[PDB]
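Dear colleagues,

For the upcoming journal club I promised to circulate an example of a predicted protein-ligand complex. I picked one with magnesium ion because it came up in last month's discussion. The inputs are reproduced below in full, followed by the predicted structure.
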Amino acid sequence: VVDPFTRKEWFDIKAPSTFENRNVGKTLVNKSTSASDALKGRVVEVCLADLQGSEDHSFRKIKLRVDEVQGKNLLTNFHGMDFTTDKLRSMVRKWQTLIEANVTVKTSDDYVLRIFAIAFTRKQANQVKRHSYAQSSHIRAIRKVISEILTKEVQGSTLAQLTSKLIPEVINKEIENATKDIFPLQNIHVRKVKLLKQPKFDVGALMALHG
Amino acid sequence: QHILKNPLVAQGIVDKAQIRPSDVVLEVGPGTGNLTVRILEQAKNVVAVEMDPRMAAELTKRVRGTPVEKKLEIMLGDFMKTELPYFDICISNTPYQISSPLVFKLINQPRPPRVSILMFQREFALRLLARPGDSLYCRLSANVQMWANVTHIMKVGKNNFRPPPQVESSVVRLEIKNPRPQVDYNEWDGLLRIVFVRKNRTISAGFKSTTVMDILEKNYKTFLAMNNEMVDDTKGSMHDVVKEKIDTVLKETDLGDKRAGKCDQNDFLRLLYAFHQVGIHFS
Amino acid sequence: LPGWGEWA
Amino acid sequence: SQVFGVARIYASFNDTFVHVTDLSGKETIARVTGGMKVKADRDESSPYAAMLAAQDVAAKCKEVGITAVHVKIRATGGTRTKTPGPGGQAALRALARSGLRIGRIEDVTPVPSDSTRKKGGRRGRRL
Amino acid sequence: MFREERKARRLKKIKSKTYRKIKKKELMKNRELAAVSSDEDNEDHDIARAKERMTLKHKTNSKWAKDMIKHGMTNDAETREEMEEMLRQGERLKAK
Amino acid sequence: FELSDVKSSKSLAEIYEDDYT
Amino acid sequence: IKFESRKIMVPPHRMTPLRNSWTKIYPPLVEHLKLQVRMNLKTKSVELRTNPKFTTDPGALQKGADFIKAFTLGFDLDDSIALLRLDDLYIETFEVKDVKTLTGDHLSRAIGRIAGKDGKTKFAIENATRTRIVLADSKIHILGGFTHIRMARESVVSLILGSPPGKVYGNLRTVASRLKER
Amino acid sequence: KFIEHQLKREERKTIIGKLQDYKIDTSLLTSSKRLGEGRQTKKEEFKEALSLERQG
RNA sequence: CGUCGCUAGUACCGGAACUAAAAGUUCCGUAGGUGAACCUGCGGAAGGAUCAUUAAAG
RNA sequence: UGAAAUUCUUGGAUUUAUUGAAGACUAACUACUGCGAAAGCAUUUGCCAAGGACGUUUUCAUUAAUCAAGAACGAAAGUUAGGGGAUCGAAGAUGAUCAGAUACCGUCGUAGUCUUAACCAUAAACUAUGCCGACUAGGGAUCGGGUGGUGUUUUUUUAAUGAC
Ligand SMILES: [Mg+2]
Ligand SMILES: [Mg+2]
Ligand SMILES: [Mg+2]
Ligand SMILES: [Mg+2]
Ligand SMILES: [Mg+2]
Ligand SMILES: [Mg+2]
Ligand SMILES: [Mg+2]
């Protein structure tokens, strides 16, 4: 007897200041009888290409969680990151070794998170062998180096600083420079970021992030 | 469909039927009538059940203009769906698809035949004939041996049937016991079904199942209700009572550690009586 | 080849 | 001036789901299925059923206010097939023809690292 | 080189008599049609006939053939064919 | 009537066009 | 008609044929479909865009992207070109392991059964069901009409389950009659 | 074998007599055929609900 | 064109009335089986017909 | 489903999103390539011992090959007594029993599938091919070690290593 969209009402979302394009679309919810309770805890997943306006990041997605509401504006915070499935399937190929590492670590902001990084062996310029398999000892050494690195950046940084590192993919270059002597590698990427636990809510820290 | 062509085996079947001249014969799966003409020869009258109207028409054509024409009667329908007349002897080479149910129908006829000669698949015939402690002893064996006695007449080969089937065959004799033993079909079948889920495991293991416990508890509550004694009816009210009843009866009967496949008629009868003593009714 | 690397 | 939605397409063997929701996904804008647009249960999975469902959702989305959608096609996944069937493809084609702008296309079929046994059994299934 | 290695490696494992039998017959046709095999000079025939007479390798006195005969293995059609192909091959060499 | 066991000279475009016409 | 883009990543093993078939692929897309075509060599993905001032058909962009995807999966160019010609052509896709968990030699022999000697068995299904089949290792793609691909799918599945090629060839022939009859 | 068979027959007769001592109907009792199900629809639940109502 | 039929229905006291009625794949080991001319669960074998593409850190 | 029907569903099914719980299994990389006496063995990291090959101008000096008797292990299934019980699933029940390419389909699902302490010792347990030893052709690919180069790349200070 009622069209819900009569009682539905629109809010617009705003992303953290770490990202260039703060406007990330709009969401709806039923009008308060409250709307804020439903709005909080909402997670929206969006490609980096939209937020940074560069197609170099077309294969990467951020999940952002709504954490505050102000005057129809939904202030969100970083909640996770991931790659597109098609990207991963393009990456994985025959005649090469997959090196996958995962590290559970907490930032300086008591943000507990988990980082998954992926790397591949590559054939040298003059190589004539078909494949580029790496011996298990090299695999273990590379994994140890990656773990030590990822722990080093995560521990000595804030979550916002961690994102500011993730966007320029500097961590991948650091991994490439660290593991260069062990074995040549290609397509070094931070595959995924999960946010396991959260600290106590601090609205001021979010207002500062959103300016 | 497969058709027999060996005359000697048909002659043996009709002979070992031992049809008295005053007997009426229920002849299932009449086929071309090779069995039927002989059975008409030495029978008072024959009642035949045919699935195929064409094939019964062929039978009528064969028997037409013959002295035994008046004796034959043909029924058209499904053997199971039909309600049958009184009959003294049952001789069948019916398709084995209805083999297992058929037997029980013969067992459950209001006036059962004194003797029946039935053709079955070899494995099924052996399971019917299986004795306690045998590998192929199963629920069917115990049930039929309660309601009848089954014996082996012949082993019928593949080559006799055309087109040759993928399994051997055999002919057996079934004799329903008159008077019938005065044990409920339902209770016996329920006990055997609960015990024969895995015939080579302990009976206690068979009763350990949760569904079995639930069924037995509901039946105990129903029995208490019938006796006018009040009952709570909640899910777990009598679990601790039924479990201890089962343990006590299994221990006292000494059947707890005996495998179902190695237990004979009397062991199951003792178990049934003890369960009725302690108040649990299965089916 | 037209369009190998530039808009065509 | 551009409002974005999310068009989740679930292409099963026996049916197709055209479910357009909000960017968060909690809010449903319109759900239309192959069954609702067809008289026979056999023809539910067909591309024709998928085609009709797309316009019905497409018409609804315009009325609400949505002008663009991000497509998320998927199959039944799990222990079953991972690739969307013709029903999903036709629905995707229909949305493009409907005039609604489409932002990005990605397959989100649930792909297990390693799964439980398939219902078929040792001898197989789908004779 | 890998590709023929994978293909050649896989064809090795298939040792079905029917599959090998069909492959040969296709191969023999191709050789005969293409005339890849050089014609035998009369001297070469004489050398070949010399060996067959001088050995008598293609008669039922061989170990394999004798075993099948004495144990009723040649009543079966397929083995009898495997015997007959051998005998005609000998008779071919015996031809003058 | 016998089925062809070799690549159809007709492309699938062509065989479907034959189907319409 | 609005400005839009597609991105279809071509796998490495299909790069060289695309370089081979490029002379015959951009003409139909840029002339008939009036679409603006590229690939990013850096990303190795063919990029197709709707040109608002020139493109007219709303469905051209999806039609072109699907046409590419057919070539990407392994279908021959002329086979894929039909997707541009027609509007009721779809691709059915599944793997061997979905039908039956076959491993080692069992998987390889199952593939051999589908393809048949010299590709005859695959071609019979191709001709009888009016479809096209690309057998990529344990990955099967079938292109054709919706009714047609279902018919082709079962014949493939029966071969996977163990049905001998000969009986499958016979069943194909009974099906072939009903197609001409209707 | 015969004499053991006769003893078994006598024991069977005694047990069957004591069984006739303890006998009831079976219409209300749930059959063991349900052992495999382990989960039930509403339709039977209505049937069971009606059955237990009839019993009281 | 008439009589009673047969099928369906409506009433009435077996009987006696009314209306309607377009038809003529091959197996191995193990474990089970109560619509068993055979089925089923688990693991294993070929003693079962390989076509296309394929250096894109090009 | 060939179409239906048992089945769930306005008390909201199916589908969407944020979580949580339980038990299995280690996709894609994956290759008859690697290891192990065989059966078998695939997520990260740590601990415990074990092992083939290679290098050795180190050590003992026949201590060796084969093996009735006898002993250790022996896929899957199975049995005894606990734990666990997600998925699939013998048995059993039940819906439908119309149509032959789709002709055995559906739902519930006991035992089992997992694990602990003992039994059982069977497979197309296959290279349908005993073990040790010598000799008898060319070729280039791969896995592990070792030797040689005044070879490329990296060490983006050199270099030395690593990768080719
Ligand atoms: Mg390896
Ligand atoms: Mg070895
Ligand atoms: Mg050593
Ligand atoms: Mg147990
Ligand atoms: Mg032992
Ligand atoms: Mg083995
Ligand atoms: Mg030697």
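Two points we might discuss: Residues 74 and 80 of chain E are 5 Å apart (CA to CA). Residues 1-2, 5-6, 9-10, 13 of chain E lie near RNA strand J (CB under 10 Å from a C1').

See you all on Thursday,
B. R.
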